[PDB]
Amino acid sequence: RGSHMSGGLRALAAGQSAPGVVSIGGGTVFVYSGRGSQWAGMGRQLLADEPAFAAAIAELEPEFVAQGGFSLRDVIAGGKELVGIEQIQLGLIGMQLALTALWRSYGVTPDAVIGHSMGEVAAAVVAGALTPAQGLRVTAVRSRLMAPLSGQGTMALLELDAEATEALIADYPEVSLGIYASPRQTVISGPPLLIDELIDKVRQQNGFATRVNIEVAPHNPAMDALQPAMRSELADLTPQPPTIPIISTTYADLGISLGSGPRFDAEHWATNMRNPVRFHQAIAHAGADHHTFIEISAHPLLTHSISDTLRASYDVDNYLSIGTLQRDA
C-alpha cells in the first residue's frame, strides 16, 4: 500500500519496477535534510510491511535507549510526537538511516551523499566516515547543547538570492545568511523578532518569505557559544575517511579540495553547526555527473531547491529529483 511513499519508492515496493530502477543519466546522490518533518503515524506502516526498515529501527534502538533515553521504535509504532530539539534531532537521524536501509533493500544505494545542515551527520554515517553509534552521539551532544536555546532563535526561507539576502540583512548584525538554498532562495537565521521583521519586509517589498519550522538559530553567530562544549564532549570522537564521496555543505570548498580530505571529527561538527550551509553549491557540483537526486526524509522539502539549482546549470530533462516519504497520502 505504502500510502506515504514517493512514486519511485512505491513502484519498487510493489515490485512494479526492477531492482534499483527508480531518459535519465547515470549516478545517484542521496540528500540528507537538516529539518525534522515528523508527520502523524510516520513510519508506522513501514515498520510492519518493510523488513529492511524494521531491521534498521531494531538495530538502532539499543543505542537510542542508552544514548537518548528515548525509544524511536515506540515513537514510530505509537505515532508519538517527538518533543524537544533532542528528540527531534535524534528521531530524524534514526529515520534517515532506516530509510537509507529501505532504499538499499530495493537495490538503490548512493554513489555520493550530500548533507544539508544537521543532515550532514547522517551523510557522514552513510558515507562511512562515522558509525551509526557515532552519528547518534554527535546528534545527542549537539542537540543537548542547543536545547536550552529553544525559542531564542529561528530561521526563514526567502525568495531572494544570496547577494540580495546579504543586502537585506546588512543592518542586522544578529541575523546571518544561514543556508544557500538555491540560486533563487536563501535562508536567514537569528532572533525570532528580527526574523519576523525581515519576513515582513520581504513580503512588503513584493517578495515571498516563510518561517522555518525550527526554534533555534543554527548557522549563525549564536552558535559560537556552543563550539567549545562541542569540541570537549566529542573530544573522543574518532572518525574514518569516507568510502563514498561526501560533498560537505559545511565549507566554502565543499570539503573536496585537492590534498587532505575533511576529518569528520569534533571540530568539523562544531564548524558545521555554525557555518552557513553551502547547499546550492553542493548540489551544483553533484549534478555535473550525477543525475538522480533522492531526498532521504519523511517529507520532501528540498526537491524544489534541488531542481532550481540543477535547472540553472544543466538540462533537467535528463535529471530526477525525488523524495522518500511524504506527509500526504
117: annotated active-site residue: yes
Shortest Cβ distance from residue 296 to Na ion (Å)? 11
Q: Does 227 bind Na ion (CB under 5 A)?
A: no
Torsion sign (Cα): 54, 56, 58, 60: negative
Torsion sign (Cα): 174, 200, 183, 321: positive
Q: Does 238 bind Na ion (CB under 5 A)?
A: yes
Instruction: Report the 3 state secondary structure along 115-170.
Output: ECHHHHHHHHHHCCCCCHHHHHHHHHHHHHHHHHHCCCCEEEEECCCHHHHHHHCC
**Closest Cα to residue 102, out of 300, 294, 301, 282?**
294
List 158's β-bridge partners, or say none: 186, 209
Q: What share of the chain is helix, strand, coil (3-state, %, to 5)?
A: 45, 10, 40
The dihedrals phi and psi of 199, each to the nearest 5 degrees, come to -60, -45
145's grid cell: 547543547
Distance separating alpha carbons of residues 209 and 227, to the nearest angstrom: 30
In terms of CB distance, is 10 or 104 closer to Na ion? 104
> Which amino acid belongs to residue 215?
E
Q: Do residues 183 and 161 touch, judged by C-beta distance below 8 A?
A: yes
Shortest Cβ distance from residue 238 to Na ion (Å)? 4
User: Residue from 52, 65, 77, 164 that binds Na ion (CB under 5 A)?
Assistant: 52
In terms of CB distance, is 52 or 58 closer to Na ion? 52
In terms of CB distance, is 45 or 71 closer to Na ion? 45
**Closest Cα to residue 36, out of 122, 102, 106, 104?**
122
Q: Of the listed 17, 33, 117, 143, which one is catalytic?
A: 117
In terms of CB distance, is 126 or 145 closer to Na ion? 126
Q: Does 67 bind Na ion (CB under 5 A)?
A: no
Of the listed pieces 48-56, 157-165, 171-179, 197-205, which binds Na ion according to CB under 5 A? Answer: 48-56
Q: Directed axis angle between helix 279-287 and helix 303-313, to 10°?
A: 60
Q: How many CA atoms lie within 13 A of 55 on its CB side?
A: 9
In terms of CB distance, is 45 or 131 closer to Na ion? 131
Of the listed pieces 94-102, 195-203, 218-226, 251-259, which binds Na ion according to CB under 5 A? Answer: 94-102
User: Residue from 45, 105, 281, 307 that binds Na ion (CB under 5 A)?
Assistant: 105
Q: Does 50 bind Na ion (CB under 5 A)?
A: yes
Binding residues among 129-168 for Na ion as defined by CB under 5 A: 131-133
Q: Does 104 bind Na ion (CB under 5 A)?
A: yes
Q: Do residues 237 and 265 touch, judged by C-beta distance below 8 A?
A: yes
In terms of CB distance, is 15 or 151 closer to Na ion? 15
Site track for Na ion across 289-328, x = CB under 5 A? ----------------------------------------
Shortest Cβ distance from residue 136 to Na ion (Å)? 8
Shortest Cβ distance from residue 302 to Na ion (Å)? 21
Count of residues touching Na ion (by CB under 5 A): 11
Q: Among all residues, which ones are annotated catalytic? A: 117
> Site residues (CB under 5 A) for Na ion?
50-52, 101, 104-105, 131-133, 238, 240
